[PDB]
Structure 1
Amino acid sequence: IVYKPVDLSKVTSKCGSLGNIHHKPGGGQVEVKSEKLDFKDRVQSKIGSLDNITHVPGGGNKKIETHKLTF
């Protein structure tokens, strides 16, 4: 008996904001007035941002193998 299995194999994930080119992405003009306002619960305001954001809870990678010989 000869038993010579070969694995020469590749497993990949990419999860991304990637290889991107941003050239001169200039911001605007933003003006906010706000008078006599009442808030009675959770607030998460955001103004004039220009952000780049990535989360990736995923992207996970898994491999399983098994070999048996019985005589």
Structure 2
Amino acid sequence: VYKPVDLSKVTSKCGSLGNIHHKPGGGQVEVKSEKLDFKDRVQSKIGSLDNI
């Protein structure tokens, strides 16, 4: 007789948000720019937020 039990209920309430900027100034072997200016705003909330 064997009869183990594993992971009997598994509930996922999950997510992934990316704002990706992969090489906007570009390039690898000859690269030039005059201003880079970053003023991004992030207001993320993650986990449990239920109001009830």
Q: TM-score range by the shorter chain?
A: under 0.3
Match of 1:11 in 2: 10
Segments of structure 2 that go 5 or more residues without pairing to the other structure are: none
Cα RMSD, aligned residues only: 15.0
Cα distance, 1:50 vs structure 2? 3.3
Q: Which runs of 4+ in 1 moved over 4 A?
A: 2-39
Q: How many residues align?
A: 52
Segments of structure 1 that go 5 or more residues without pairing to the other structure are: 54-71
- Identity within the alignment, %: 100
The TM-score with structure 1 as length reference comes to: 0.16
Task: Pick which of 42-51 and 30-39 moved more.
Answer: 30-39
RCO higher in structure (CA 8 A, sep ≥6): 1
- What SS does structure 2 have at the residue aligned with 1:28? coil
In the alignment, the residues of structure 1 paired with residue 14 and residue 46 of structure 2 have an alpha-carbon distance, to the nearest angstrom, of 28
Larger radius of gyration: 1
The TM-score with structure 2 as length reference comes to: 0.20
